[PDB]
Design a protein around this nucleic acid. Structure first.
Ligand code: DZ4
Ligand code: 3D1
Ligand code: CO
Ligand code: MG
Ligand code: MG
Length: 422
DNA sequence: ACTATGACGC
DNA sequence: TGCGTCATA
């Protein structure tokens, strides 16, 4: 139960299964229980894929691959596309579905919304209460209909394995020690089973969850048994789980830092970090990242679940590749205006719904020839929620950046974001 | 030339 | 602070 072994909390991560697909299926019943996908608003090669149904994943379909190329592998494949507005994607439908789920989770515990379809939950308090109200009654497997215990058992049919693993887990749980970490996780999974049932009952959406002692393990556990299932990862299962867990699959190590770890230490798996001393890790990744790595490879992490439901920023952007790159003043003014209008639309609802106002406008662009996501970013005061004014304010700041008569090189990206709410 | 939000260091 | 860079859905 110690902080020392990082078994001090019960944390869960809930993520909706093929979220965009499910949102479309709720509107159109005919799309249910059939292989389908959702492509971006642009139609070329059938459109880029962002969300794929599980039925369709069986045929090998993935996101980030062309729709028509996906078609060949799964000809039965049904397609849904993001509605278009002001020349760009319209995600209102999904954002609205997102709100539904979040309000339901917030009823069971305060949450930390981490993305449009997932949120972390700190269930530590709720678990104590459940242990109080239970009054010593045992936990039957019937309260965990969709739970997988990572690492078990030791020694369609897949359902048989799940229950056997679940039974050995339950048969070895502490009965008298209410502060037993494993027992705490188990109760946390019970609460999550209820939470997920409510989400489905009230919205029809299905999802998965991970229950463990920290955000990193909870997030990792969540992807272990998808879809419509939840996974419990105990501290004792970590050595085994990490023995062959690719380093880049761990939260915050999917990019350069993670690549750097693989490269500098000559390892591929999380479990291999264990052989290094904390000082070796600090001398190579820094005091802070070194200590974090030292503890994380042992299943220990302390980032707290921070209650957040409201976005810290609201923004939108658009890319204009190749021929399309924005060269003239007319072009840049118009697209800035389209973006600012979407911004105004969202900021308005934001103010109507949450009584806060953005005081700052951030403008970001990318000039043709630049490999980076964004070439530069600037900001200015956001006094009025007026799209025309904001468009001109944004234009003035990008005009300042730097051929004094047109844009050379041209812009391949425009970005507007409202922040500094108060 | 295949499309959002959040955090960190300084 | 404001900004470049990094992380990830
Ligand atoms: N790179 C991207 N660009 C645009 N939209 C994206 C995106 N990544 C995800 N989305 C949109 C599309 C998604 O529907 C949604 C959720 O992202 P996930 O949770 O990553 N993926 P899903 O829910 O689909 O499947 P499951 O979790 O079961 O694996 O956000
Ligand atoms: N690579 C990383 N990804 C995410 N968070 C990290 C990373 N390295 C250090 N930290 C954090 C965690 C601690 O709470 C804190 C140490 O005081 O800093
Ligand atoms: Co004007
Ligand atoms: Mg998802
Ligand atoms: Mg997600």
């Amino acid at each position: 139960p110690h902080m020392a072994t990082g078994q001090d909390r019960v944390v869960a991560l809930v993520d909706m299964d093929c979220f965009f697909v499910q949102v479309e299926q709720r509107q159109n019943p005919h799309l249910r229980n059939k292989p389908c996908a959702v492509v971006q608003y642009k139609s070329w090669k059938g459109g880029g894929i962002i969300a794929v149904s599980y039925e369709a994943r069986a045929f090998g379909v993935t996101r980030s691959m062309w729709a028509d190329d996906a078609k060949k592998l799964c000809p039965d494949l049904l397609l849904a596309q993001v509605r278009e507005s002001r020349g760009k994607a319209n995600l209102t439908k999904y954002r609205e579905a997102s709100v539904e789920v979040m309000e339901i989770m917030s009823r069971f515990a305060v949450i930390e919304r981490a993305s449009i379809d997932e949120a972390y939950v700190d269930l530590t308090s709720a678990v104590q209460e459940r242990l109080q109200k239970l009054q010593g009654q045992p936990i039957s497997a019937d309260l965990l209909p969709s739970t997988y215990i990572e690492g078990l058992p030791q020694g369609v049919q897949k359902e048989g394995m799940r229950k056997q693993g679940l039974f050995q887990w339950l048969d070895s749980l502490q009965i008298d020690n209410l502060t037993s970490p494993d027992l705490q996780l188990t109760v946390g999974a019970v609460i999550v089973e209820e939470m997920r049932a409510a989400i489905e009952r009230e919205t029809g959406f299905q999802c998965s969850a991970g229950i463990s002692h920290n955000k990193v393990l909870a997030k990792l556990a969540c992807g272990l048994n998808k879809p419509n299932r939840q996974t419990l990862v105990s501290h004792g299962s970590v050595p085994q789980l990490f023995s062959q867990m690719p380093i880049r699959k761990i939260r915050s190590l999917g990019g350069k830092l993670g690549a750097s770890v693989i490269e500098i230490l000559g390892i591929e798996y999380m479990g291999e970090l264990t052989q290094f001393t904390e000082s070796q890790l600090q001398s190579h990744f820094g005091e802070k990242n070194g200590s974090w790595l030292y503890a994380m490879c042992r299943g220990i992490e302390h980032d707290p679940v921070k209650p957040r439901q409201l976005p810290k920023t609201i923004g939108c952007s658009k890319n204009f590749p190749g021929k399309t790159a924005l060269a003239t003043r007319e072009q840049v003014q118009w697209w800035l205006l389209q973006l600012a209008q979407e911004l105004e639309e969202r900021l308005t609802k934001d103010r109507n719904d949450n009584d806060r106002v953005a005081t700052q406008l951030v403008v970001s662009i990318r000039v043709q020839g630049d490999k980076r996501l964004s070439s530069l970013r600037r900001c200015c005061a956001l006094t009025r929620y007026d799209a025309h004014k904001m468009s001109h304010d944004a234009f003035t700041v990008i005009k300042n950046c730097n051929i004094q008569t047109e844009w050379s090189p041209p812009l391949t990206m425009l970005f507007l974001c409202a922040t500094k709410f108060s």
